[PDB]
Amino acid sequence: QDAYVADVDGILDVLRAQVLERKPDDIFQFISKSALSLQVKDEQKSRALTIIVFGASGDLAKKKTFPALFDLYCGGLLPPEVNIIGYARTKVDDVEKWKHETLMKYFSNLSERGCHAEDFLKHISYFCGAYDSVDDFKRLDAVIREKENAFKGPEKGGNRLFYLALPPSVFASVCESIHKGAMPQEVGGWVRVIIEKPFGRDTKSSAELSQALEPFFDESQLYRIDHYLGKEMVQNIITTRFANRIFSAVWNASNIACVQITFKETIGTEGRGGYFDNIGIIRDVMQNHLTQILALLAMEKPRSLDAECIRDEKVSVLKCIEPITKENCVLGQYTASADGSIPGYLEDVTVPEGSTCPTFAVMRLNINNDRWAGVPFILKAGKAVEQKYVAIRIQFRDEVHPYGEATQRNELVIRAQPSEAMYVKITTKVPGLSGDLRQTHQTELDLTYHVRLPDAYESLINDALLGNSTNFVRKDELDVAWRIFTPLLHQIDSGEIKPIPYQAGTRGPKEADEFIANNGFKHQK
Amino acid sequence: DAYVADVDGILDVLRAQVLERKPDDIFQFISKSALSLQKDRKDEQKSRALTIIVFGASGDLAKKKTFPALFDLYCGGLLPPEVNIIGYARTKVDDVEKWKHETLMKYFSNLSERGCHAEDFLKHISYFCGAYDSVDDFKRLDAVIREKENAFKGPEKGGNRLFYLALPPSVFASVCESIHKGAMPQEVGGWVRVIIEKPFGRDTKSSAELSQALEPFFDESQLYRIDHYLGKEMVQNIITTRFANRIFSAVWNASNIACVQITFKETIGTEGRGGYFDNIGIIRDVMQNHLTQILALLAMEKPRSLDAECIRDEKVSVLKCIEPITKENCVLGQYTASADGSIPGYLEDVTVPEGSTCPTFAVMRLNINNDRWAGVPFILKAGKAVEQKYVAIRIQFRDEVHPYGEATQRNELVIRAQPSEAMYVKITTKVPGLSGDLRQTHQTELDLTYHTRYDVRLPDAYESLINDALLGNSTNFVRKDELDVAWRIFTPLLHQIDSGEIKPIPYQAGTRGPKEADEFIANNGFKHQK
């Protein structure tokens, strides 16, 4: 009765999303040929499922979390009768208008998925309330409990995933509202809460935040997101090394010379620089993303492939890492480039005067155990640099004999961005006319055995839906991870080291490239 | 017409690529090689004059085996422009140049993709009629050689002389004395090298005798015992992949390797030449000489250079650690008629005696006993009239039982050198199809060598040693002491076979061989993917 108006405005705006995602020569025919085009998985369905997204119209939820859920709906990884609930403080007039202009503008690839698009919005309902009012959680508890019992399944109760797409200052009170008014029925079901970075800003900050949530949810239920890490690149580190004797036997200090984990991004902080100015490149991606990546490379053998034995080795090996020292660190801060297409970092009005905040840093970490003593581990992240390339690179020790200068170090690389790739660099015979044994030429050998593809974030959200806690930092490791970085962070705030300038689009400060070369890395030539 | 005469030009390259290389998962091969072609975009042998004398010039080997080989090297530019080749045999030749076109040129490869390059080559060939023992006839040869050495416009003195003995071994001792007394290179300069052909004795004492008969005339720097089945391409796979790369160098020992199998297969029978084989046996045919040389290259310790005689130093080095093969560690076979009937039995041959215990098939276990190899079983297998035609290396590394259990099996490196060359490492990887579990794995194959040039029909295996001998490369040729240590490994077994203590088990052609043999491989550390 309400809105035949909103029903078409939804139809027209999906078609407008496609005309600007596939630029049409003949717009008139695109709007029309794609007009009528919009015409054990045993255990998904055992019980009903509800996804509650808080901060539902915040920038994080609308632009990254709800569109993520859309991709799983099209991929068929969500149960058929899932319901999603958007939770936000501000009221909305008619919700279906809100779905078409707050949620659906940010759904990507709508020319392959557009027919599913307006079906997807039928699974989301809106709920307006406060993140601290126990009564509104009793009204939320009522609204979800009335579709849990409307469930067509064999087995009763319901499973509840609460996504806190909120700033961290709100976390402790939303987790109290769940405990006192929104826990799943004892008739059956689990509760899992996904919490978002920043998980503190140093050792004491993050122990306090984790102690605020301790009485409300244990580690079996809390899922700390690191949405820059994907399932694709974690089974590369675990399966290639631990199922294969070729790599398992060579994965130590007796054969490895240098390990570098590199995170590059071509874009700086466009207009959110003031928000970054309090973070720093270390806190943004290094302490969380690159360190969990590093945890998987250096871990001893987990005595199972169960989630908590993998996480068990992540704490054991991070506990052997000596905290970064100020001499072992180089920082940069990006300025305007000679191209002129990017303004400087300080050319942003959002950032205060004269701040020494780094947009680029490279550091050395020394793992102290039998397996890794002596091997330098190099972490590098930088904003507004030459290219967008996140990759792992391991350099094995050179076989100087007998080939001398006819061979160089074997190299294993794992790349996650822009495109996934895994390959090893080795020296092989050249099919010379006469040939020669001294005439070799380095080659690249692939290790990947190549329909909708889920990104890193979707298969992290799906990992939480399936009960897989492997790729989420857990309480003890988050603390020991912080204890690694904060002595450096404290000394940087004290100004004991200062950032070195570099213009954007360059590789970064050239003292950083010097630091890499002086710490066991050898370049092809 | 419109650029896809070019596009069909490089699925042409992939078509030849996939059927030279058993993928069995052809699908990602053609892709992983479609994208590897994305990134694919000697003065001194005029120093001296060169003369090649091939004995037995109209013997069956020389006309069919060696003369066509030299022709292919002529087109490859691997022979000097002023090269002199002379055929030496006694048989009557009234007209010589007619004899070259129509006893020699009928066996020249390709014949018309070359163009008239065939008749250019034959113009470097001369005939010489004489006896393999007449010291006077060699002084007449020395004169005719000095009359082709003197036609050289080089600055350089002298001439280089390569004598190819396309003869049975009983003639060897007399032509090497005849060369010594009347046909050695000029004193002004040049080397002499002798290539002697396949059967070097038939046991320790037979072959020791033949080498002391040649000892007084030529040292190991001058004698080149040829084995046409090795080839440079596969020894550069064995040597370079392991010794230039720490990934493989560190796992190339007993602590990571479980089983290595060297296999020689042929679909062909004795071709009716059976009586001829009957005194040789498959062990002497390919196992003691060819596959043992292959095994030597896999198991050798690090040579402290890549010079030929430091490589050979490590080859006799490791063969000295092999306990002699024992008969309990051996099973033999003999091929019979096929179920199709397309291959007749070995004994269905008129050339072979009744009641012969000659093996057409053998698989054995060898124990290399030193720090690097103690415990690792080495399995040699040779067979005629079997499933398929392939010589290949199979090395199986020990399984990582934990943590992947039955989601993984043993890692495998294989080297297969043929017309069907291939090198690949087979290991377990994640499957990208997200049902997002780790136990959810699949073994796949990873190639290291691709066929990218294809400009060519470049040197085959046999053509690569002749060229190696011209270049002074002793690497793929067995040495006096090394030939001895190889015989001492096999001859206790060979005597017991001739004494009949073990006999060959019957098998039909086209099958894998005797069924007791495959069980023997299974009982000696070998595991099937399943």
Numbering used by the authors:
A (entry chain B): 10 to 48, 63 to 473, 478 to 552
B (entry chain A): 11 to 51, 64 to 552
Sentences from the paper on this structure:
The housekeeping enzyme glucose 6-phosphate dehydrogenase (G6PD) (EC 1.1.1.49) is the first and rate-limiting enzyme of the PPP. It catalyzes the oxidation of glucose 6-phosphate (G6P) originating from glycolysis to 6-phospho-D-glucono-1,5-lactone (6PL), whereby the cofactor NADP+ is reduced to NADPH. In the present study, we describe the crystal structures of Leishmania donovani G6PD (LdG6PD), both native and complexed with one or both substrates. The LdG6PD monomer contains three domains: an N-domain (Q5-K49), the NADP+ binding “Rossmann-like” domain (residues D50-I248), and a β + α domain (residues D249-K552).
